[PDB]
Design a protein around this ligand. Sequence first.
Ligand code: SF4
Ligand code: SF4
Ligand code: SF4
Lengths: 628, 628
Amino acid sequence: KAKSIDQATLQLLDKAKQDGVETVWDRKADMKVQCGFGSAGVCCRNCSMGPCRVSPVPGKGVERGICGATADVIVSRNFARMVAAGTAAHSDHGRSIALSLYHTSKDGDIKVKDENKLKEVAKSFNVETEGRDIYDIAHDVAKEGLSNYGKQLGEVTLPPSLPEKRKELWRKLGVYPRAVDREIAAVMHSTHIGCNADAEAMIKMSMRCSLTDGWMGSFMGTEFSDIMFGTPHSIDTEANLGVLEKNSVNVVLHGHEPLLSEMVVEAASDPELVELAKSVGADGINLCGMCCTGNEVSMRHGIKIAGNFMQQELAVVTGAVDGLIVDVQCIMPALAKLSKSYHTKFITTSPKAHITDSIYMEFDEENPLDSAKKILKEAILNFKNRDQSKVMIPELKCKAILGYSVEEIINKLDKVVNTQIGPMQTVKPLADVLVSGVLRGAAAVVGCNNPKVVQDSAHIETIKGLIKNDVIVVVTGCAAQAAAKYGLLQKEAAEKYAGPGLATVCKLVDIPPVLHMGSCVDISRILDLVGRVANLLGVDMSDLPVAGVAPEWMSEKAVAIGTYVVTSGIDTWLGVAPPVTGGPEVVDILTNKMEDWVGAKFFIETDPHKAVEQIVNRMNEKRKKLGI
Amino acid sequence: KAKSIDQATLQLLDKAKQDGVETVWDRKADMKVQCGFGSAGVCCRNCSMGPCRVSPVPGKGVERGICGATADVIVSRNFARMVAAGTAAHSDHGRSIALSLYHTSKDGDIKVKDENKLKEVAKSFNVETEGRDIYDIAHDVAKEGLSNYGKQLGEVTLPPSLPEKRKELWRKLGVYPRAVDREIAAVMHSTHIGCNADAEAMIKMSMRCSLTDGWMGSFMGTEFSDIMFGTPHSIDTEANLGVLEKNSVNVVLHGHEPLLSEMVVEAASDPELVELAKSVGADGINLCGMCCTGNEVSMRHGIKIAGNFMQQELAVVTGAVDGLIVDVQCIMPALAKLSKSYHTKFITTSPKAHITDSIYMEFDEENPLDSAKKILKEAILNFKNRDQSKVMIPELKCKAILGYSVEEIINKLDKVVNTQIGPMQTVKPLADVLVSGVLRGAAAVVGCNNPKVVQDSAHIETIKGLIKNDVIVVVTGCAAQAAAKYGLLQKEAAEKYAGPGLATVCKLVDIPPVLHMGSCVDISRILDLVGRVANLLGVDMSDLPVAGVAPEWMSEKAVAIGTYVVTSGIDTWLGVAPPVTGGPEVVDILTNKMEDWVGAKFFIETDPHKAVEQIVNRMNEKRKKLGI
Ligand code: SF4
Ligand code: SF4
Ligand code: SF4
């Protein structure tokens, strides 16, 4: 089968074959037929009595592990641990952001750039703002956010966009969230040998844990990032590997933590570093981003996006990356080995993400700007080691428009508001187009790449099908970057791919049919948006014609995201089967019984066209239930 | 191979074969040859690009997972997740204890029974005590303990017995603990795909996480349990399955959390329940304990111990267990199936541990005594369903002495203190016998059973070898219960098994050669004891001739325990190989490089006699280093 639908990706794969280096596709081929027990989730290693593998087919073979655990128990515990790991990644990201907010000052490297957003957040956290210094408010808000992570007494703080009905449903179901780290610890405790051996209770614990990701960790990370670095607005950028410059220093920022990439962007305008780039024979400094850190700097500053997850290696294959600076998460360790075949300096910066044989330059949060400057200086000095005979940058780049935060979307919707009617600054125009049926619904396309799927194929096919069916699409993460590379993040795309209702809406509001809402933590924005719509219509989020899709997901973070999206009341389609087919009870819970608990459920569909059809049918069913 | 060295265990295995019921041994046989990849730890399932298996033999076969992770990376991440799971179990136990302390009242079900212990703990937590109400002090202490779990700013609180040198070494190494749930979340975050791919850093993160178990979670759980339920003192009890009564109601308490078992013990003396037991035709109520909850109620009240981990099923096989009340952890789910073959009521009580097809009666912490009375009444009423023709109780039980908390040990040591010299109430006599060489050292024997080892064989052989070599032995958990069943927890055992120096010490202090220090969380007591000795000698804990042994461990909790014992500076022998042989770098870190970091290291030895020899040699070389 084809490795990708992206032509620049194919050219660089040919180059990697010529250079004798191996990619993620080569390692996937080397893995051959993957273990059936692990693929079905019926393998357990939770204690040293094991490893235990039970039959994925009920009634045949070994039925129980040594402790007596059934296939359903093993599957449910494995699924719960995936959710706990994803929640941990997102919560650690949000915790770093909250600590950075706590360390803001007027004359420091980290300031408050959006005071209005900070005051609204302070209102949401019961922090007084009138007649107060802005940094005192910021510190109080950071304290409340940090308490959300580890409070042992009392209730956590949730955003006002979350409907009261959803909160009450969670409380009745027993999944109402506690402090984030406490829920992660609870999930890890209940999967220990000889604890929870009941699939339904295990799934409910995993949902409870995922809620602390969706509504607390990711939400606080996003809002505090907006406070410190600015709320995203409509902005132009370029996407795909063609953004690399042969005649300039190329600095590629890969990872998820935004403070480092923000400081690197600021350092790139330093006169001394620009002069140094000139002195090593380069035209200038060309910052490019990848994955979620690329999404953040692109949403807030228009930094060009070099590529998504499965392109990271190919960025090095060009031979033009002088410095690849990585913080945490979705950083393929093979990069270190790959960096030996080129001049590239592979720089790790976080104590959480040491990588063997990489150059470690710890990013100092006490002096973020100076630390970013020294890291960037190492990348710039590496330009002298460039071998221009090994350089091949495909001439394939695509224009994209992004920056669609909830605030930006509301500002855009204000155009189609009659002044004599109003109100202004609400999601009411979006609610109106959804209720009238001009738009059939809204769908979130999120997730990673996965060698099991032709890279970017499922993302593009799902998005085109949805917008052709007058479903407005919001995108995050690597799916958003696939849309950017393909050319869907363009106003012109409205008349090229969208159906009649969505084309009319795009023309009236002057937006692309696909709205890039940011990184994987920025999925919280989507929740926020949906919540507002629900609160405007006086219904729960499970009554709306909305859906989420993860066509090509790979990470534990994706599992946690899908779990909290379903738990919030939004049906989720998975384009990659999770390791649960071995447990019939777990499959039945996730795809059938979940609708009785939270009004939504998982859909597993590896065919994107069938997924689009199912999404449209489900949205029409919910519309008929709602009367619209 | 023999299944056990215990004769009562063998008789009940014959009965289980005659009854056509499966045991843990039968399921272990059914599992046959366990997966080599999982056994070596070279299998990874951390993302849905996998499952990935790399060769356990370097230089052959597949070398890297799909993301590029090496065998060392996969092994280190698997080990770190085991540590995180064990830390989560212990920390959740301690968190429940702290919450119970927070709800103590003068006229409530949960009171303060050891005010002196509470005042000393309050001193350790910087809580004022002079001229204050005892329950105000208790609530402040509980607040400080709870803050240890989830504080995001500042430093955690550690017991005064921990040497300053050990803390400084931890700070220099980068493993100084943070809040417990924060460290669990950090480990889970760093094992996520594309985060940490460096074995040394991964092992250091796991050590940092395990420290929050050893010195914060388990320590606080133990000390708060002492405050609420009484400090253990020397007390007699009986052990092994013979403690069951044919003519009495048999109520078996299995699990770890002590509040439920304490309330059940209190409810058993209720006049209405005793009258009800008489009216259903029984002579009375016979409470028996298993595993750690049995250890707690036995340490504090002399409740008879029915058996350790791999005996739980056999307790039901007798046909005499009218009620089996379980809370969390090390509860084989197969019990639910097994109790169908008998009249036994298998009662789950904790929302953390639901077991399918068991009778769920949620233990209400708000009204603990009434809830325990209701559960106990269900067990008593089940006596009418006893089938006395199916009853077979082995006439095999053994006298044991336990209750050796640090306070009790100090009280015993006061006997050999010359009044004209002093001081009293210190560990000085123990330090003196260790320094003079009358005792060669002290060894902690802890851990579970494991079907991979003849049950209780390794525990008994290791303990007998150590005490024969004049090494005083402290025991916890299932190892302590194996010692109890065998008969080592007896004063007479001093003249039957101990060497000359240990026999003299036992005669002078009037103690058994093997000291039962309580449950698995009570391993913190051992740390406390060692710390005091170190603080009395002005040395670090790695300079002492001490060791820990886990001859037959199975649980993730055992992994976390061994990790924090080694990190505290105490060499640890493992009688069951952990899944790390596939990663040569991880093996080298755990067994060789750890000594450079923390002055102690792991020893993997499956032969108990060889383990005793190695322990004696290591203790002698540490003595020669210390000059004693
Ligand atoms: S999933 Fe289990 S059975 Fe399959 S290779 Fe991995 S450890 Fe072995
Ligand atoms: S927890 Fe149970 S099923 Fe899992 S490895 Fe241990 S004995 Fe086997
Ligand atoms: S994390 Fe890497 S090694 Fe583990 S399953 Fe995913 S791709 Fe394979």
